[PDB]
């Protein structure tokens, strides 16, 4: 089930994988605006696809 | 903040409460006593090797 | 057993010297009476858990104590910056597991005074320590010596056991020449 | 996923080597659930050491614990391990009874033996503690419920 969970997540939105599991609550903050900008425009250029 | 929902106490906290002390073998009373009993037996049988019943009482010759 | 040389004379007629009467009866009589009231307290922890019927790990278990139905305090009203966050989380488990072992050690301070009443007013009949019988001109004997640690050796025997079958030689070669008997 | 491709019990790897993989992809080394789930590999690793050192007089000194620590040995399975070494168990009895330096320490080697090589002598916490044994079991269960109910929020 948590496979499957990861499954979905990941056919629909594959850029998911370029955030580690352990990093992911180390860009959060309080705000969205306040979110480390460490993975925010790597995440937005991956999602638009390999062309 | 899904982790705020999962059980705060963790699975390290769990056994260290519910395995709290090292339980007691059922074979440790026994080679304890018996090694025990055993120089009650080589103090007094009348049958060992060293036997205290000549150090107590000495001779009579 | 060698003892040290001294060649000297007493010069006055002293005193017989007496020595002073050593407790050490006294504190293995409070050791024993201290080892059968915490028999007594094990007895009475035992007969307070049965009375309720509850489970033995429950107790035990600091997660049973943990209140899941607690306020959860939101992250995004916290003023947080980017690595703030992970420390925030493990601030709000860390408190509410500490809730959970004071919480835990909250009852059991208070099963220990509900224990320790019981077994006040409570007699005790338990069992000796077996050990070989000793009187000061007697001597023990093998057969004495040998009872005790059939005494030792019944209490390795478990209070419920499964009756797991050995088979008998004379049961295994009655099988093994009749399976020879018909070519097997 | 990574290390979480696989489940906690099913890895080439020993329990506590597969806790310690786990908590180090599912957390940072500053973190309060990596030092509980190291923690927690210590603890599985004193019970693959206490593991080990029960199964090493039958099965030698490689004795594969990570097989035993997945499916563990049935009540049929310990009897068949017990009657295995049962003829070396009785002539290392006589031999140590008869290399005994008294007569008393000749007779309790026998009997404590006498009562070793019986496998209904074989103390079997599901038999003896019926009701803890399955608190012990719900224990492990309720671990893996409250994560089930983490993959059913969301």
Do not use: C
């Not at chain 3, 910056?81 to 500490?98: E, L, M, W």
């Not at chain 4, 996923?1 to 906690?8: D, R, V, Y």
């Amino acid at each position: 089930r948590l496979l499957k969970l990861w499954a979905k997540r990941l056919l629909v939105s594959p850029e998911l994988a370029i955030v580690p599991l352990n990093e992911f609550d180390a860009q959060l903050a309080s705000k969205f605006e306040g979110i480390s900008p460490k993975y925010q425009e790597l995440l937005s250029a991956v999602a638009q696809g390999n062309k | 903040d899904r982790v705020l929902s999962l059980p705060a106490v963790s699975k390290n906290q769990v056994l260290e409460n519910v395995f709290h002390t090292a339980p007691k073998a059922p074979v440790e009373h026994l080679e304890k006593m018996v090694s025990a009993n055993s120089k009650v037996y080589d103090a007094l049988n009348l049958q060992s090797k060293r036997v205290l019943i000549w150090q107590v009482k000495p001779a009579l010759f | 057993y060698l003892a040290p040389l001294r060649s000297d004379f007493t010069e006055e007629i002293t005193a017989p010297k007496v020595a002073s009467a050593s407790n050490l009866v006294n504190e293995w009589n409070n050791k024993k009476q201290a080892t059968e009231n915490l028999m007594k307290l094990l007895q009475a922890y035992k007969d307070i858990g049965d009375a309720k019927s509850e489970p033995l790990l429950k107790n035990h278990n600091p997660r049973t104590f943990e209140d899941r139905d607690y306020p959860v305090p939101d992250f995004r009203t916290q003023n947080l910056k980017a690595g703030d966050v992970p420390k925030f989380f493990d601030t709000v488990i860390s408190t509410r597991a500490s809730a959970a072992i004071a919480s835990k050690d909250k009852f059991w301070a208070g099963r220990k005074t509900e224990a320790e009443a019981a077994s006040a007013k409570a007699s005790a009949a338990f069992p000796r320590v077996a050990v070989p019988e000793w009187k000061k001109g007697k001597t023990v004997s093998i057969e004495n010596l040998n009872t005790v640690t059939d005494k030792y050796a019944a209490a390795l025997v478990p209070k419920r056991k499964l009756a797991l079958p050995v088979l008998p030689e004379g049961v295994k070669k009655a099988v093994e020449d009749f399976a020879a008997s018909v070519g097997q | 996923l990574g290390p979480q491709m696989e489940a906690l019990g099913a890895s080439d790897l020993l329990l506590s080597e597969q806790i310690r993989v786990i908590t180090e992809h599912r957390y940072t080394p500053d973190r309060l659930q990596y030092k509980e789930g190291m923690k927690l590999a210590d603890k599985i690793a004193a019970q693959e050491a206490a593991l080990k050192e029960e199964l090493k007089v039958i099965y030698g000194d490689n004795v594969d614990v990570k097989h035993f620590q997945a499916s563990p040995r049935t009540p049929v399975q310990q009897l068949f391990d017990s009657l295995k070494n049962a003829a070396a168990n009785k002539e290392r009895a006589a031999k140590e009874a008869a290399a005994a330096a008294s007569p008393y320490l000749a007779y309790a080697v026998t009997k404590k033996q006498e009562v070793q090589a019986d496998p209904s002598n074989i103390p079997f916490d599901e038999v003896l503690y019926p009701q803890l044994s399955e608190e012990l079991l719900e224990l492990e269960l309720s671990d893996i419920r409250e994560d089930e109910i983490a993959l059913e929020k969301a």
